[PDB]
Amino acid sequence: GGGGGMKLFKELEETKEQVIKMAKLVQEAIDKATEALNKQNVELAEEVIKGDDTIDLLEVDIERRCIRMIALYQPEAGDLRMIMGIYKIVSDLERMGDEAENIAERAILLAEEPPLKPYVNINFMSEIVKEMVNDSVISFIQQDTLLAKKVIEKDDTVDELYHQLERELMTYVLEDPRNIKRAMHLSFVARHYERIADHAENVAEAAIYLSEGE
Amino acid sequence: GGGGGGMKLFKELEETKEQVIKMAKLVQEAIDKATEALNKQNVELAEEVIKGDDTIDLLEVDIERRCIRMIALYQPEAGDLRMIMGIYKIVSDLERMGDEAENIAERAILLAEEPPLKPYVNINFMSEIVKEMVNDSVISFIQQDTLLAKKVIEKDDTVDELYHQLERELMTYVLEDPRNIKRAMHLSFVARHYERIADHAENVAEAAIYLSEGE
């Protein structure tokens, strides 16, 4: 190799740092989004809606870093794979953040009214999903198949849990159509948790590609 | 002063761009069949959309593996490397559109086992726009047409607006006889998928802007 070959190294270990940061900010979104939604708390919602902008540039900035690294250093097979993969996931991660930002909106909408039901399921879902966000992005940065496979296993649960939700609400709507307004908002929410999870699972799918690459 | 890598990278990039187009045809074809299967309560048509989604899946990989090939072998500079990464990004949005139409098709099955519940003028105006959004977004990409990409970005607000019309129309159905609760919700999801397909369409046009703004 040549002199500045270890530049690509530093540049890449940093870019990775940033992915991890961006994911810290995603879990923070979901966590805030769930509190707001739960305890009918708008300060917590507007917080989450402001903070998404951060996550937005984080996509831009990590993407731009990838191109740079490829343009400047000409990374070999392994690096180039690590990089294009980063390039993919930073998008999924941005989508999770946007999904949470959506739960944040809804929670505002659900605040000008009594809950209509304990949010127990939304909650079990919420908890599984953050675990999924984290574990998925860990298993990527460090080539952990087993951990990626677990994340992929958990998704069938979120799916399964989502369906529980679809049906409980059917019964709420059916017992008093007034309830139609909350039911629906609480439907979306569940759909958003389910989208965040599906995404999580991509990161993991990616993590395998990478790990299978060795 | 030469270098035979130039000419190869050119063919490879054009052949890939061609692949991307193949892929958007199939997505348009998907949305199209799925709307027929939805409307005409036709499961033959739906199971088609559903097997046909696999073709689109492999095209994502196909093109993605193309992009890495092209970078590794030819060490492409500025404009080229940019179109490639960009191809890489949008071959995905496009796979997501096909995924959403596949979902429309799954619901069409489900909706077949019962009367309509309503004509579906809305869902129809929606996909008709959406389908044209898929095309234009991917045209605008291949030839960096900013003005055409921005036309796409506008239409999206229409889908957005059209989507909302639809959830209120349904609210009224559920409200009139909760039996309708099952058809209503299925039609609810469908109306969301159309809106997701449009929102992806709109990413591609954003991308098309990245490329264009660049040259």
From Swiss-Prot, chain A:
GO terms for cellular component: cytoplasm. Keywords: Cytoplasm, Phosphate transport, Transport. GO terms for molecular function: protein homodimerization activity. Pfam families: PhoU. It comes from the Bacteria. GO terms for biological process: intracellular phosphate ion homeostasis; negative regulation of gene expression; negative regulation of phosphate metabolic process; negative regulation of phosphate transmembrane transport; phosphate ion transport. InterPro entries: P_transport_PhoU (IPR028366), PhoU-like_sf (IPR038078), PhoU_dom (IPR026022). It is found in: Cytoplasm. Belongs to the PhoU family. Plays a role in the regulation of phosphate uptake. In this role, it may bind, possibly as a chaperone, to PhoR, PhoB or a PhoR-PhoB complex to promote dephosphorylation of phospho-PhoB, or inhibit formation of the PhoR-PhoB transitory complex. PANTHER family: PHOSPHATE-SPECIFIC TRANSPORT SYSTEM ACCESSORY PROTEIN PHOU. Homodimer. This is Phosphate-specific transport system accessory protein PhoU homolog. The gene is phoU.
UniProtKB/Swiss-Prot annotation, chain B:
GO terms for molecular function: protein homodimerization activity. One of its GO terms (cellular component) is cytoplasm. The keyword Translocase does not apply. Disulfide bonds: none annotated. Keywords: Cytoplasm, Phosphate transport, Transport. The keyword Transport applies. It comes from the Bacteria. It is found in: Cytoplasm. GO terms for biological process: intracellular phosphate ion homeostasis; negative regulation of gene expression; negative regulation of phosphate metabolic process; negative regulation of phosphate transmembrane transport; phosphate ion transport. Belongs to the PhoU family. PANTHER family: PHOSPHATE-SPECIFIC TRANSPORT SYSTEM ACCESSORY PROTEIN PHOU. Plays a role in the regulation of phosphate uptake. In this role, it may bind, possibly as a chaperone, to PhoR, PhoB or a PhoR-PhoB complex to promote dephosphorylation of phospho-PhoB, or inhibit formation of the PhoR-PhoB transitory complex. Homodimer. This is Phosphate-specific transport system accessory protein PhoU homolog. It comes from Aquifex aeolicus (strain VF5). The lineage of its organism: Bacteria, Pseudomonadati, Aquificota, Aquificia, Aquificales. The gene is phoU.
